[PDB]
Amino acid sequence: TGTANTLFGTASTGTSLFSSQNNAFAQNKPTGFGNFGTST
Amino acid sequence: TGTANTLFGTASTGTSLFSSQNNAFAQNKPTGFGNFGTST
Amino acid sequence: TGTANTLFGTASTGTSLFSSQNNAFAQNKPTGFGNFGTST
Amino acid sequence: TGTANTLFGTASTGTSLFSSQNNAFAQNKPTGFGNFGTST
Amino acid sequence: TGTANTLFGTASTGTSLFSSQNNAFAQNKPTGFGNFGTST
Amino acid sequence: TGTANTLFGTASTGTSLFSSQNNAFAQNKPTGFGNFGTST
Amino acid sequence: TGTANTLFGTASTGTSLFSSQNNAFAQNKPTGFGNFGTST
Amino acid sequence: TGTANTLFGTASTGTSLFSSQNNAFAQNKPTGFGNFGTST
Amino acid sequence: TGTANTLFGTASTGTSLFSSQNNAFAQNKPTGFGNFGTST
Amino acid sequence: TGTANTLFGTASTGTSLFSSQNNAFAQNKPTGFGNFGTST
Amino acid sequence: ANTLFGTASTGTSLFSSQNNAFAQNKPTGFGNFG
Amino acid sequence: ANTLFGTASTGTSLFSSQNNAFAQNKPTGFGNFG
Amino acid sequence: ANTLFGTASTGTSLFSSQNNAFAQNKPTGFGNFG
Amino acid sequence: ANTLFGTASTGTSLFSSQNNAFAQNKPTGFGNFG
Amino acid sequence: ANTLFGTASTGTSLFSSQNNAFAQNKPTGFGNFG
Amino acid sequence: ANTLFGTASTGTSLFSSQNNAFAQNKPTGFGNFG
Amino acid sequence: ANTLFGTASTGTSLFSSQNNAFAQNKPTGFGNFG
Amino acid sequence: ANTLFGTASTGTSLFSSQNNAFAQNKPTGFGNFG
Amino acid sequence: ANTLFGTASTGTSLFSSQNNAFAQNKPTGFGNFG
Amino acid sequence: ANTLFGTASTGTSLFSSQNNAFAQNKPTGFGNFG
Amino acid sequence: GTANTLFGTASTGTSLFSSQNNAFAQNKPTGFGNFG
Amino acid sequence: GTANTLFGTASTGTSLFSSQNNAFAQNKPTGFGNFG
Amino acid sequence: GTANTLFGTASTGTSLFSSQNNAFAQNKPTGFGNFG
Amino acid sequence: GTANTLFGTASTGTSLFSSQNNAFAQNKPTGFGNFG
Amino acid sequence: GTANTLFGTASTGTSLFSSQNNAFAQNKPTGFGNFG
Amino acid sequence: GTANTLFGTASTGTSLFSSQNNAFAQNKPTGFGNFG
Amino acid sequence: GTANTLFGTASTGTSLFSSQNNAFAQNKPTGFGNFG
Amino acid sequence: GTANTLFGTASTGTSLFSSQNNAFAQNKPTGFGNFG
Amino acid sequence: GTANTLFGTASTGTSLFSSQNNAFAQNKPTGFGNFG
Amino acid sequence: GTANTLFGTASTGTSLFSSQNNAFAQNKPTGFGNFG
């Protein structure tokens, strides 16, 4: 809820739910998430 | 909910749900998400 | 919900659901998402 | 819901659902999404 | 829902569902989406 | 739903469903979407 | 809730729920999350 | 709740729930989280 | 609740719940968390 | 609650609940936490 | 006296977008001079 | 006296977006001169 | 006297986004001169 | 005298986002001159 | 005299985000000159 | 005289985030000149 | 005279985050000149 | 004269975080010149 | 004269964090010149 | 004259953390010049 | 040399003494004054 | 040399003595004054 | 040499004596003054 | 040499005597003064 | 040599005598003064 | 040699006599003064 | 040699006589003075 | 040799005569004075 | 040789005659004075 | 030889004649004086 202010970069204030960030020089099959089976 | 303000970059205030970001120099089959089977 | 304001860049306030961003120098078969089977 | 205002760039306030962005220098078969089978 | 205003660029407020953007220097068979089989 | 106003660029407020944008310097067979078989 | 302000970098104030970040020089099958089966 | 301010780096004030960060020079199958089965 | 201010580094004031950080030179199957079965 | 200020490093004032940090030169299956079964 | 009764209900919306703009007294004047 | 009764209900929205903008007295004047 | 009765209820929203903006007296003047 | 009665209730929201902005008297003037 | 009655209740929110911004008298002037 | 009655209650929130910002008289002026 | 009545109650919050910011008279001026 | 009545109660919070910031008269001026 | 009545009570908090910041007259000026 | 009535009570806190910061007149000036 | 855009502006000739004032709000922006 | 963008601006000719003032709010921004 | 962007600006010609003033709020930003 | 970005700015020509003033608030930022 | 970014700025030409003043608030920031 | 970033800035050409003043608040920051 | 970052800055060319003044508050920070 | 970071700065070229003044508060920090 | 960090700075080129003044408060910190 | 950190700084090139002054408060810290 508080004010974010950078000068050169990223100012974030939001809520990030479920964020995957796999990051390398070399990767083999990087997956973010799996399958989503939703019922109602 | 708070104010974001950069000068050179990214000011974000929104809510990011389910964000995958796999990033390398070399990748092999990077997937974000899987299958989505939704029923109602 | 809060105000975003950059000068040179990206000011975002919206909600991003399900965002995949796989990004490299070299990729092989990068997929964002899978199959979408939806029934009602 | 909050005001976005850049000067040079992207001000976004909308909600982005299901956005794939695979981006490299060299890619081989980058797919955004899969198949969409929808029934009602 | 909030006001977007850039000066040089993109002000967006709409909701973007299902947006693929695969973009490189060199690509081989980049597909956005797959097949769409819809029944009712 | 909120007002978009750029000066030089793109102000968008509409909802974009299913938008593929594969764009490179060199491409080979870039397809937007697949086949559309719809029955009723 | 308090104000964040960097000059060169990342000022964050938002709440991040469920954030995986596996990052190396070389990885083999890095997954962020698993499967999501949700019912209501 | 208190003000964070770096000059070159990361000023954070938000609450981070459930953050996994496994990071090496070489990894083999690093997973952030497991499966999510949620019912209501 | 108190003010954090570095010059080169990380100033944090937020509350971090449930943060795993397993990090080596070489790892084999580092997991952050396990499975999440939640009911209501 | 008191002010933290480094010059090169980490100034922290927040409360960290449940933080695992297993870190070596070589590890084999380092897990942060176990399974989370929550009911209400 | 002018009245507007407006409703816009959707039921079971999947992968959809609904924008509802209930504006009351929204004038737009481009050039107001004097 | 002008009144607006506005409602926008959705039921069982999956993977969806709903934007509801209830504005009252929202004028927009581009050039106000004098 | 102008009144706005606004409601926007959703029930059982999965993976969704709801934005509700209840603005009252939101003018926007680009160029105010004199 | 203008009044706004605004409510935005959700029930059983899973993996969702709700933004509720109740603004009262929010003007925006770009160029105020004199 | 303008009044705003605002409420935003959620019940049983799992893995969700709720942002509630109750602002009263929030003007924004970009260029104030003289 | 302008009044704002604001409430934002959640009941049984699991793994969730609630941000409640009750601001009163929050102006923002970018360039104040003279 | 402007008044704000603000409340944000949660009941039975598990693994959750609640941020409540009750600000009164919070102006922000970027460039104050003269 | 402006008043703010603010309360933020939680009951039975497990593994949770509550931040409550009751600020009164918190201005922020970036560049004050003259 | 501006007043702030602030309370933040929790009952039965397990494994939790509560931060309560009751600030009164907290200005922040980045560049004060002259 | 501005007054702040602040209270933050917890009852039966297990394995918890409570931080209560009651500051009065806490200004922060980064660059004071002249 | 040559300049290729697909969208946007491709410009080849050199550009000298160019003023531009970009804001959301400007009071008396000038590029140039008087010559001689 | 050559300049290739797909979107945006590709510029090849050199650029000398260029002023630009970028803000959200400016009081009397000038690029240049008087010549002789 | 050559410059390739996909989005953004690709620029090949050299750039000399360039002023830019970037802020949220500026009082009398100048790039350059007077010549002779 | 060559410069490749996908997003952002790729620049090949050399850059000499460049001023930039970056802030949230500036009172009279100048890049350069007077020549001769 | 060559410079490759995916996002951000890739720059190949050398950079000499460059001033930049970065703050949240600046009173009269100058890059350069007068030449001769 | 070569410089590869994925995000951020990749720079190959050498950099000489560069000034930068980084603060939250600066009174008259100068990079350089006068030449001759 | 070569420089590889994933995020941040990869720099290959050598850097000589570089000044930087980093603070939260500075009164008249200078990098360099006068040349000749 | 070669320099690999994942986050942060990878730098290969040598660095000579570099000044940096790091504080929370500085009165007249100088890197360098006058040349000749 | 080679330098590998995951986070932070990996530096390969040698560093000679480098000054740095680190404090919370400094009155006139200098790296270097005058050359000739 | 080679230098491996996971977090922090890995440095391979040799370092010669380096000054650093570390305090909470310094009055006129100098690294170096005058050359010739």
Numbering used by the authors:
A (entry chain P), B (entry chain M), C (entry chain J), D (entry chain G), E (entry chain D), F (entry chain A), ...: 85 to 124
K (entry chain C), L (entry chain F), M (entry chain I), N (entry chain L), O (entry chain O), P (entry chain R), ...: 88 to 121
U (entry chain B), V (entry chain E), W (entry chain H), X (entry chain K), Y (entry chain N), Z (entry chain Q), ...: 86 to 121
Sentences from the paper on this structure:
The human nucleoporin Nup98 forms fusion proteins in certain types of malignant leukaemia, is a critical component of the permeability barrier of the nuclear pore complex and is mislocalized in cytosolic deposits in Alzheimer’s disease. Key to these Nup98 activities is its large FG-repeat domain with a high number of FG motifs. The most aggregation-prone segment comprises residues 85–124 (named Nup98FG85). All four fibril types display a parallel in-register β-structure comprising short and kinked β-strands.
To gain insight into the molecular organization of cohesive FG-repeat interactions, Nup98FG85 was allowed to aggregate in pure water. EM revealed the formation of well-defined and mostly separated amyloid fibrils. Using cryo-EM, we determined the structures of four different fibril polymorphs (pm1–pm4). The most abundant polymorph fibril, pm1, was resolved at a resolution of 2.8 Å and is formed by three asymmetrically arranged protofilaments. The structure of the most abundant polymorph, pm1, deviates considerably from the flat two-dimensional (2D) arrangement of cross-β-structure sheets. This leads to one chain forming contacts with several layers of the opposing protofilaments and the formation of a cluster of phenylalanine side chains (bottom). For example, the aromatic ring of F102 contacts three other phenylalanine rings located up to three layers away. The pm1 structure contains a large cavity that is predominantly lined by polar residues. Because the Nup98FG85 fibrils were prepared in pure water, it is likely that the cavity is filled with water molecules. We obtained values of approximately −20 kcal mol–1 per chain for the four Nup98FG85 fibril structures.
